[PDB]
Design a protein around this nucleic acid. Structure first.
Ligand SMILES: [Zn+2]
Ligand SMILES: [Zn+2]
Ligand SMILES: [Zn+2]
Ligand SMILES: [Zn+2]
Lengths: 121, 122, 122, 121
DNA sequence: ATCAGACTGCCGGCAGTCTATA
DNA sequence: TTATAGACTGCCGGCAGTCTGA
DNA sequence: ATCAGACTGCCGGCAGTCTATA
DNA sequence: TTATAGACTGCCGGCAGTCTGA
């Protein structure tokens, strides 16, 4: 409503600024992969309908660096698109469907937030 | 870039950001009743350089505002929303000599202009 | 053994220095009452046999002060002689046995260890 | 004063109980070396007159394990005998006198508190 | 369904009164 | 008995969260 | 100018070896 | 002489931030 005009002026916290930076890094990695962008948007678009793994190269430690701060990608993007407060990779368990989950220690890793489930420690 | 906007449309907001919207909604409802205040507030945020007049809302006896079950100080809130998200005390804010109704005054009404206040370490 | 010699050289943490000062304060108010130390020392000496109330004037505020640090008298001494880690009075249960417990609002308080029991806080 | 009789019945917190446990390990450990015990008592007894290094064998990590708690020896004993609030080895600098300070990385290390000085930062 | 005004709780600092001690 | 030093009760402040009634 | 792969620091737990003491 | 009790070194893990180099 009228509030929409005002919230344009709301400034963003440091995290959201970072989150935006983290997403840009993702699209840069995902553009080289063909079709991956649409599957993620479809994955994000609809919760119910399964989606194919969306993958990125997996580091030796598995930590991604974005804008000077390291993190684990599935943690980062699940926090971005599903649970903002998600505290650690311990809170995430992979799904049976996921071809390239985090534990697998394979070459690429699936960062689709809907391939994971949140659990209490 | 636009595709990033398409994806970031799907981003979730932290409890606070969800709250900031609720606080802004509460103010506009309270602020809509006075008719000349609404445009000036937008003009003050719209214009950084030119000063703009006090925008007022009633001061409770203790001075706390309640939005969605959590109380706050009205001036720190909207300063937190529109200027400094990192703001955490009213001790960090010093009113300006311009403000007819600052928080310290203990008057009937309070000025919610984020730009009538100044940020200081303390 | 020889360790006794070395531990004489050991330094004490700020709290243990505070504990000594608080105990010094207790006997000073306690010395005015005759024999109270003996019932207290016997109570501390033997856990099993119950012992008479040892009381101190109860402030309006209920807070005792020793050297700029306020506290609740029954908590302070239960912390000295029974539980060093006692965090707050909620953790303490008075006894049906005790004639004078902190919850009592008379103008005196019984600070007897072994007259209270430790319970899990809410 | 008269309080000394009752204050014996004061209970001791977890740290002090450990401190005694730490001191006991030292002497038992420090008894095989001859004369060290006297020098340490002399070291502690007299603050102004200097005393020779008091030594114990130095591990690969430099950490000493006592009663399930790992620590650095010169830190422990300075904390016991000199500054109880001493937080870390950073706060400690050796004296020009000390023959086997912590930095030396020698076969044995000097745990005499008075061979060290406390420093800001 | 939600907020304003009340309350109590908790926690400090402070000043006038209080206690040693020479 | 007297003067000067440090004590603490009591009072005050801020802070923050709960609850009934508007 | 920014990120991957390294390193060290810090801090715990763990297991095999050591030491009393019966 | 032997076995069983408790001890600790050394090693190991995860964690986190720095730095050089691609
Ligand atoms: Zn997947
Ligand atoms: Zn103003
Ligand atoms: Zn009692
Ligand atoms: Zn030395």
């Amino acid at each position: 409503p009228a509030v929409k005009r005002l919230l344009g002026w709301k400034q963003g916290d440091e995290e959201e600024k970072w989150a935006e930076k983290a997403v840009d890094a993702l699209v840069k990695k995902l553009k080289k992969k063909k079709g991956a962008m649409e599957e993620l948007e479809k994955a994000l678009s609809s919760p119910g309908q399964p989606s194919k793994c969306v993958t990125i190269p997996r580091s030796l430690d598995g930590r991604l660096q974005v804008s000077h701060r390291k993190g684990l990608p599935h943690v980062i993007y699940c926090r971005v698109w599903r649970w903002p407060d998600l505290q650690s990779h311990h809170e995430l368990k992979p799904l049976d469907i996921c071809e390239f989950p985090f534990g697998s220690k394979q070459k690429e890793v699936c960062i689709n937030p809907y391939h994971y489930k949140r659990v209490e420690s």
